[PDB]
């Protein structure tokens, strides 16, 4: 269709207006004193939230160009979300701060490419500096502390997570399920988790977690691509009976077949979800087999002249439960017999012996760890279904936060970590004045999170920022009590991973907008 095309300044003011509407709606929810945002629904009472992602998802603007700016920066939150699962609001205020001052510098005549280079250099050094200030979370005591703090001071949740990580290792798989009633339960079952998410949304039966969950499902392990539904018809019907859901783990499920699965499972006509097989090439087949040995299934490969049509419920694997995210599939408690599984382990164990290459050695050790590691399951205590469902949510969050903490450590929260990093880069310089302006744009933006947290408290941003900058180390502002103090001692911590991600994604998208010269969109008609 005919297009509307805008260049330079005209495009720039539009983009800025768009990010401002999105960022302003989102940032009011930041921190302990975050304000509520009311989101209208077509039916019933409006949604009232303090969750940044919930607000961002609703934002769409009428002006086509302004809307592009909002959708672009919306990418910041989503990516930060996918990478760290927290700090999407922080990332959005950082992006708005960099974009605002960056576009001003552009309008002033400064070189966009140089501004971006300066911003990027500052971020590169800032991340290194962030790592230097990071405090490790390696021993179980630390893990327990972070867990407790993330569970609203519930030492119970802290001990649970610490024990779970002591079982399967801090790098191991850990899940949480409803409890049998009163008292928590922690047991390790035969399970595995690989990096492959659902082949499309819709499969998502629990939008609360934006994931797909199946109970006691059958697992089809096809070593090939599936384009024609015909091949599935025989097995899908065999699964239609026994009233159990089906998990498709094939090399890939293309359009035709996938489209059908999305439509049928959409009408309650058999619950089926598909995900790509882990790895690629040779190791792929070997890994597809590990899943079979674990779930007690049979790989259906064309290499041995096998057909999906000639596949019965006996070939299918099975597990008590499977969960899949946007990019992760976890099989909990497989039917496979410890004899077959443990044997498979022994095999791969020798593979490592005969390993003539570190790479092949690494890849093999990865499989044994997955197949021999299992999956720790945390069954949340109870005393009434309501409280149980609640504690479960806390455990889930605490667990998520502790996991991130374990990966990259923790830093002072309340935005002070970024403020401390900014002060350490006061002498950073680039190749020219425009690059230096870019550097300053970024260091200035690093104060935005703390400032917005203070603003939401109803206090003066410049005053608090000035005071915090006046001190050093973990000295910061506790927005809940409105008192200054040591952020670590007051238990206000952020996983270094979410702070780093919020900053990198904000800068990444800001850099793109700052160097955008033209925008194309459909004519408002």
Ligand X SMILES: Nc1ncnc2c1ncn2[C@@H]1O[C@H](COP(=O)(O)OP(=O)(O)OP(O)(O)=S)[C@@H](O)[C@H]1O
Q: Does 29 bind K ion (CB under 5 A)?
A: yes
Q: Which residue has the tokens 């109803």?
A: 458
Written as six digits, the tokens of 186 are 């922690």
Q: Does 108 bind its own copies (CB under 8 A)?
A: yes
Of 86 and 434, the one with the shorter C-beta distance to Mg ion is 86
Q: Does 458 bind its own copies (CB under 8 A)?
A: yes
- The CA distances from residue 371 to 150, 284, 342, 366, 440, in Å, are 30, 15, 8, 9, 50
Given the rule CB under 5 A, which of 86-94, 172-180, 313-321, 499-507 is the region that contacts Mg ion?
86-94
* Torsion sign across C-alpha atoms 76, 81, 84, 86: positive
Written as six digits, the tokens of 367 are 């499989």
Written as six digits, the tokens of 263 are 């439509």
Alpha carbon 352 to chain centroid, angstroms: 33
Query: What is the per-residue binding string for its own copies in 381-400, x denoting contact by CB under 8 A?
Result: -xx-x--x------------
Question: Is 238 a known ligand-binding residue?
Answer: no
Residue 113 interacting entry, from Mg ion, its own copies, K ion, none, C-beta within 5 to 8 Å by type: its own copies
Given the rule CB under 5 A, which of 28-36, 79-87, 277-285, 487-495 is the region that contacts Mg ion?
79-87
Q: Does 12 bind ligand X (CB under 6 A)?
A: no
| Distance separating alpha carbons of residues 137 and 480, to the nearest angstrom | 24
Residue 346 interacting entry, from its own copies, K ion, Mg ion, none, C-beta within 5 to 8 Å by type: none
Q: Does 86 bind Mg ion (CB under 5 A)?
A: yes
> Smallest Cα–Cα separation from 137: which of 409, 404, 399, 366?
409
Beta-sheet pairing, 375-379 with 483-486: unpaired
DSSP 184-237: -EEEEES-EEES--BSSTT--SBTTTTBEEEES-EEE-EESEE--GGGTHHHHH
Question: Is 384 a known ligand-binding residue?
Answer: no
Of 401 and 510, the one with the shorter C-beta distance to Mg ion is 401
Q: Does 329 bind ligand X (CB under 6 A)?
A: no
As to burial, measured by CB atoms within 10 angstroms (0-12 exposed, 13-18 middle, 19+ buried), residue 269 is exposed
Instruction: Rule CB under 5 A: choose which of 34, 217, 245, 476 binds K ion.
Output: 34
Of 93 and 411, the one with the shorter C-beta distance to its own copies is 93
**Residues near ligand X (CB under 6 A):** 29-32, 34, 51-53, 86-90, 413-415, 449, 453, 478-480, 492, 494
Binding residue numbers: 29-32, 50, 86-90, 414, 478-480, 494
**Residues near K ion (CB under 5 A):** 29, 34, 50
**Residues near Mg ion (CB under 5 A):** 86
Binding residue numbers for ATP: 29-32, 50, 86-90, 414, 478-480, 494
């Amino acid at each position: 269709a005919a297009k509307d095309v805008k260049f330079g300044n005209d495009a720039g003011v539009k983009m800025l207006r768009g990010v401002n509407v999105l960022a302003d709606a989102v940032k009011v929810t930041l921190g302990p004193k975050g304000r509520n945002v009311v989101l209208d629904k077509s039916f019933g009472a409006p949604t009232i939230t303090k969750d940044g992602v919930s607000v961002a998802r609703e934002i769409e603007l009428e002006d086509k160009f302004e809307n592009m700016g909002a959708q672009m920066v919306k990418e910041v939150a989503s990516k930060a979300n996918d990478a760290a699962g927290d700090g999407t609001t922080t990332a959005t205020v950082l992006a708005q701060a960099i974009i605002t001052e960056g576009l001003k510098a552009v309008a002033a005549g400064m070189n966009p490419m140089d501004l971006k280079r300066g911003i990027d250099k500052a971020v590169t050094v800032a991340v290194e500096e962030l790592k230097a200030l990071s405090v490790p979370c390696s021993d179980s005591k630390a893990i327990a502390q972070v867990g407790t703090i993330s569970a609203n001071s519930d030492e119970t949740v802290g001990k649970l997570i610490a024990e779970a990580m002591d079982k399967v290792g801090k790098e191991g798989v850990i899940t949480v399920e409803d409890g049998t009633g009163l008292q928590d339960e922690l047991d390790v079952v035969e399970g595995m988790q690989f990096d492959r998410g659902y082949l499309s949304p819709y499969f998502i039966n629990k939008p609360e977690t934006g994931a797909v969950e199946l109970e006691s499902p059958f697992i089809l392990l096809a070593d090939k691509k599936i384009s024609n539904i015909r091949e599935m018809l025989p097995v899908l019907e065999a699964v239609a009976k026994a009233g159990k859901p089906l998990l498709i783990i094939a090399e890939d499920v293309e359009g035709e077949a996938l489209a059908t699965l999305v439509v049928n499972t959409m009408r309650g006509i058999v619950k089926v979800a598909a995900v790509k097989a882990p790895g690629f090439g040779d190791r792929r087949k070997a890994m597809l087999q590990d899943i079979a040995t674990l779930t007690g299934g049979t790989v259906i490969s064309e290499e041995i002249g096998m057909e999906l049509e000639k596949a019965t419920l006996e070939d299918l694997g099975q597990a008590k439960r499977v969960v899949i995210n946007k990019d992760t599939t976890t099989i909990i408690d497989g039917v496979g017999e410890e004899a077959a599984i443990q044997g498979r382990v022994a095999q791969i164990r020798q593979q490592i012996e005969e390993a003539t290459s570190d790479y092949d050695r690494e890849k093999l050790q990865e499989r044994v760890a997955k197949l021999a590691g299992g999956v720790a399951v945390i069954k949340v205590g109870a005393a009434t279904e309501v409280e149980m469902k609640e504690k479960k949510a806390r455990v889930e969050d605490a667990l998520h936060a502790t996991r991130a903490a374990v990966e990259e450590g923790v830093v002072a929260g309340g935005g002070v970590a970024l403020i401390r990093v900014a002060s350490k880069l006061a002498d950073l310089r680039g190749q020219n004045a425009d690059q230096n302006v870019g550097i300053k744009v970024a260091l200035r933006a690093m104060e935005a999170p703390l400032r917005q947290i203070v603003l939401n408290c109803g206090e003066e941003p410049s005053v608090v920022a000035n005071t915090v900058k006046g001190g050093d180390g973990n000295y910061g502002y506790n927005a809940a009590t409105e008192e200054y103090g040591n952020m670590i001692d007051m238990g206000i911590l952020d996983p270094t991973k979410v702070t780093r991600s919020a900053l990198q994604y904000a800068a990444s998208v800001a850099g793109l907008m700052i160097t955008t010269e033209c925008m194309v969109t459909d004519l408002p008609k």
